[model samples]
Each structure stands twice: as C-alpha cells, then as structure tokens.
Target: ATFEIVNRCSYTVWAAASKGDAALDAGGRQLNSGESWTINVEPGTKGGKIWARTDCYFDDSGSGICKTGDCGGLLRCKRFGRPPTTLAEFSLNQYGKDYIDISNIKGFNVPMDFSPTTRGCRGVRCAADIVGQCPAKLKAPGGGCNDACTVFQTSEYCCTTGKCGPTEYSRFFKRLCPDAFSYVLDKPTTVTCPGSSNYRVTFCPTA
Candidate 1:
C-alpha cells in the first residue's frame, strides 16, 4: 500500500508509520508547511499506522521529544505513536479485503482524513474540532483528549469484556465524530476498501 502524507498546517510535522518492529516509513525535519512525503510499503503490508509528531526537536542523529504524538522518542520510529493522536490505520491486500480506519479511540491531537484512492470505497474521517472542545477531565497535558477508559481505567468505559456499550463519556466523542471509533467496540470503525488501495493521510485535513 502507498500513502501520501500531506502537511496542510502552517507548522511542521514529523510523520511516522510502522509495522511490528519494522519502520516501514519514517520522516523527520518537518515535512514543512505544505510539503508532502509518500511512503510505499510492501504489498500485503499489515498492522501499520500513520501518525504525526508535533513541536519536535531532534539531533543530527534524530532523537527528540514531541509536544504530542510521540513515537517512543525516536526520529525513526519502529512502533506506534503515543495516545491522543490522530491515527490512520490500515491492512492492505490481506485476507479478502483491505481494512482502514481513522481512529479517535486513542484520542485526537489533530484532525485527519483517510482518503482511499481506489474504487468501491467511501472515505472516513475525524476532521472535527476535538481539541477545542475537549472535555476537561480527558484533556491532555499538552493537547488532545483521552477517553474515559484512559482517564478512569474502568471496565465501564474500556468495555473490557465487550459487555458495556456506549456511555455518556463515549457519547461525547460520538457526538462530534460519528464516523470514528469512539470506544473499543465501536460498531462501524473499519472500512472495507479495495485491496491494493492507495491513500492520502492528511494532517489538518480540510485546511
């Protein structure tokens, strides 16, 4: 699968994508305003997620901390980003169909759009002002929101046994982002896109 990472915001963003312990694609030095980097992972690639880091500072060797969406403090990340991030996840050409989801289950640091470029698939997004109206208890230290599962660590919100359905806390997220995975057992989080689908992961999407 191939993904085009576009930085639509005025500031820089360090984009990261990984599959297991492999760094499928990692970019540093701020894909500065309006620039883009394209990552073409191997065919049949799975378990990869696309996310961005903000307010980052790295040495020549590439190590740094970010204000949000950090991926294990490494410029060349081999793992997923920390929570409170806008995530675009995918599994391409695997099984019978391609699966993709723009998730807020980890909370959202920025707005994002996961646009499939192939046929027979409709795009999914969480491109709303989540941070602006983020609930006080779920607010991140820097930015982003956390689910009640993350905030309270309770089965009621985490739905650990898949017994709990939506809660007032989860409904807060659903109200704003109806298309995203508000909780773990969200009914319609995954999208069935065409196999071998190419995509665009846009930061500050609609900017």
Candidate 2:
C-alpha cells in the first residue's frame, strides 16, 4: 500500500512523521504548494502510526513564518489494495448510524486516486441544508451527504446535524428512481452500488 501526503494548507510543509513508540521522522523533505509524496508500504507489513509536520520557513526577511517548524499534525492513514475488496463493510445500526468493521481480508484493493461524485443540485442541497455544515455532527448518523433530497434515497436517514430521523428513506429512492446513487455530506463524494443489490451498503455523513 502507498501512503500519500497532500499539502492542502496555504503554507509549505516541512517534514512528516510516522507514529511509533519512537518518532519515525521524515527528513527535511519540503512539500511546497500543492505537492504530494507517496510512500510505499510493503505487503504483510503491519500498519504503523503516520503523521506529517511543517517547518515554518521564512524568506530573506526575519519576519516570515518561523524556524524549528511544527512537530505535530498527522495524516489519516488509509490502506491500499491491489483488488478492492468488500471486506471493509459499513452498515447503519438500528438507530440509522454507520460503523466500519475491518475483517481479516488482506490485500483489499482501493483506488489510489479517489474521485468524488459530481454532485448536482440534489447533492448540493443535502450538504448545505441537511447536514447543517457541522463537521462533528456529520460523522454520527453516517458520514457523507444527507440521504434526503437526493436521487439516491436509501432511507430517511437524514445526516443533517448528525442526528437520525424517524422516516426511512431507504425505499424512497427505489420507489422514485429505482436506479440512482445517494449523496452524503462530509463523506467521500463517491457513489456506491452501481447496481441495485441488497448486499451492498452505502454510508453518509451526519450533518
């Protein structure tokens, strides 16, 4: 699997670190602008803690960012597989919440590059209105755009405010548009279940 470090912030990042009992430091590899670094992890290797740090570098003037850099902030570690597996199953509980269960399935392949679905009017509405734009609240009921007001309505599970609603919108989409993918805010902008299959489960973020 390959781990990538993306510089999303405005400033340039200095060094990165991997989490271990001892700090596994990434040398002074400067990631400027929108640069990224991909680190390869061999198969059968147990995943370890990984994070990135940025050093405050200044220009010729003494009043720039700083020196010594910052030594915290970790990147989320995601595993990559050659052939994507459905092992990482996510399902909503009775309360209309989603949970991830990691199985022994190894070498599960996931796309190295993630492509989010092009949310149209429905998607935009769910993210802005339903989820209430709350970060923490989005993860509970599910993690993605709200299932409400979208073409893909699996259940009435409104992810807005991270709270579950009573109405079951699961059959809503099937009844309206039998073939469509649902959108969720805060979650990856990808659609699941290309075909209508009960075995497949989709997760959305809570607003």
Best by TM-score: 1
TM-score for all models, in order of appearance: 0.93, 0.27
Candidate 2 yields a Cα-based lDDT of 0.28
Q: Following a full C-alpha superposition, what root-mean-square deviation does model 1 have from the true structure?
A: 1.6
lDDT of each: 0.81, 0.28
What are the per-residue Cα lDDT tens digits for candidate 2 across 1-207? 343544443555443333222233332245665676655433222223222233444344322331222222222212221111211222222232222232211111110112112221111111112223322322223222223333232333434455443333433322332222222232233223211111211111121
Which number leads on lDDT? 1
Residue 162 lDDT in model 2? Answer: 52
- TM-score: model 2 vs. ground truth: 0.27
RMSD each, Å? 1.6, 15.3
